[PDB]
């Protein structure tokens, strides 16, 4: 059967409200006058006052902004009756999908991370891991998917890019010889976490690596 497609609405809309989403119609309206209604959470049960339908035209309406992180989906039903109140259709299921906007920035779990590694180790050796979270959707979008990088290293002795970082895991690894405790006992790495898998907003934290005997 032909139905109303799921209605996809981005969270944080500006309106104007009320906003027309889609128009219900029963083809029994050429013969008789038809009246429409909606039921379900958001329409005639909580949350209150989120949706409505225009009784005579069948236009489905959104009355307020939505927030995907509160409620991601709504399930409503559209009904069509004649003037005497008799049903003229099986109810129509109407889905509303609230699609994610990138309304959260990434946040490191702590502002300074510490680790330690032996002067001897070969390139490829894992040292430490850093982590950032992001409360947006990480399944259907990248808004909650964080990419990591090393903005810079201090000091640059013996040279720069002593370390690398895996852009998804946040694992920091040694990628060159030669570290020496006596020479440079400590590196300071400015690390960045960028949502939209590298295309979005950035947060910065520090990772200190002590060189050991």
């Amino acid at each position: 059967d032909w139905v109303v497609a799921p209605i996809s609405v981005p969270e944080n809309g500006k309106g104007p409200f009320p906003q027309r989403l889609n128009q219900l119609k029963s083809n029994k309206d050429r013969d008789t006058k038809i009246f429409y209604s909606i039921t379900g959470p958001g329409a005639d049960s909580p949350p209150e006052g989120v949706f409505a339908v225009e009784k005579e035209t069948g236009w489905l309406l959104l009355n307020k902004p939505l927030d995907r992180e509160e409620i991601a989906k709504y399930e409503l039903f559209g009904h069509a009756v004649s003037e005497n109140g008799a049903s003229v259709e099986d109810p129509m299921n109407i889905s509303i999908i609230v699609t994610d906007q990138n309304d959260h920035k990434p946040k490191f779990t702590q502002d300074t991370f510490r680790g330690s590694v032996l002067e001897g180790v070969l390139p490829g050796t894992s040292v430490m891991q850093v982590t950032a979270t992001d409360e947006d959707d990480a399944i259907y979008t990248y808004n909650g998917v964080v990419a990591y990088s090393i903005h810079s290293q201090e000091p640059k002795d013996p040279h720069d890019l002593m370390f690398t970082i895996h852009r998804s895991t946040g694992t920091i690894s040694v990628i060159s010889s030669g570290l020496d405790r006596e020479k440079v006992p400590e590196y300071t790495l400015t690390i960045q976490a960028t949502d939209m898998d590298g295309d979005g907003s950035t947060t910065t934290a520090v990772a200190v690596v002590e060189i050991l005997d």
Epitope: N12, K14, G15, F17, P18, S37, I38, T39, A43, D44, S45, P47, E48, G49, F51, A52, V53, E54, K55, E56, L61, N63, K64, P65
Partner: single-chain antibody
Framework: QVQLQQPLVKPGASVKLSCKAS????????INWVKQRPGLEWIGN????????NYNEKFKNKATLTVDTSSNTAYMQLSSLTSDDSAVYYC???????????????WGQGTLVTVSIENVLTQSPAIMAASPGEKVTMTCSAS???????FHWYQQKPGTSPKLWIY???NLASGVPARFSGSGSGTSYSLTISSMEAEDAATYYC?????????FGGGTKLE
Amino acid sequence: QVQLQQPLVKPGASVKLSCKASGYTFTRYWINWVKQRPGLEWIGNIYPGSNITNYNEKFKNKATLTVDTSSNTAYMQLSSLTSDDSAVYYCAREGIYDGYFPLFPYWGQGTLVTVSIENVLTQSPAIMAASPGEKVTMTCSASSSVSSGNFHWYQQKPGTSPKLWIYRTSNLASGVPARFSGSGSGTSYSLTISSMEAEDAATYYCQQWSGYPWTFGGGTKLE
């Protein structure tokens, strides 16, 4: 319980009116403002969580609506006052929850200010009188069509805020007796009392929405 609490200036000054909200989550419900002088007018409304407004073009330049989320308070600033601004100002929260466009049945008690392209609703008669037992009917006509879902009636007695009476053409509000009945469609609507009573004497106002702004009739005073 949903409650809106509202607590004298010279011409040209500004004043900020407050509407303190409790009994529900403040951020997720539209608050509307309304003016009254010796009829009723819709000024505008605001959705607190996002600070989104709708204004009546008529008050675009007088009124600014704000909120303070921290204190669950809506504000309306009135600028550059004249004698015309002296009125009663009500706040009112949305609405009735049955799948149709909400209205606003929860009013504050109003604040009194004394100063030293729409669907017009014509109500008649302006003043009428009757005796108990008699049938009473009154009428409201609109320059343009209105959904039966968006046509409402209120009762107001002097000294008190308006009080939702009938909604969506024919449903009786909570405290309202069976004697009352509403009907109508398109552009013509009516309110009817099978048998008048002492209780029922008051000013009755029709109300519509069909896109913004909300409008009211000039009122029917029953005695």
